[PDB]
Amino acid sequence: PNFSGNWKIIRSENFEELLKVLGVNVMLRKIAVAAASKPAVEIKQEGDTFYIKESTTVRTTEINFKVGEEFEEQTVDGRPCKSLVKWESENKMVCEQKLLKGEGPKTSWTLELTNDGELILTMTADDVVCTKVYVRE
């Protein structure tokens, strides 16, 4: 399993609802959902080390981490968390996040590489689940 690639989105489910429970206000939400129409996701994996960049017309976000080692990452709405990724299986990693300040929805994300070359991202905020599917460009 090598998650490396330039990935383009082919389906998305429930992203706007995710942002709502994350408390993003309606104005900022409409801006976000519209932009998320044509993102680019770039991943590079070397062993257990990862870099992930996701870009829309309004914003680019970049993160790097190593599976199994704590790191810091913001929630999708910009709140700081301590995160830790583990392999759930050979083709699926799961990130658990703990907010550093205040209280808020419990957040997580997972990334899975299917045998037919799709990348599936799931993002959770409390009970809301968002799913995005990408293929290589």
Ligand SMILES: *C/C=C(C)/C=C/C1=C(C)CCCC1(C)C
């Ligand atoms: C619309 C989807 C996102 C904003 C997801 C961003 C994202 C990735 C594409 C890779 C995993 C981390 C995370 C920042 C959630």
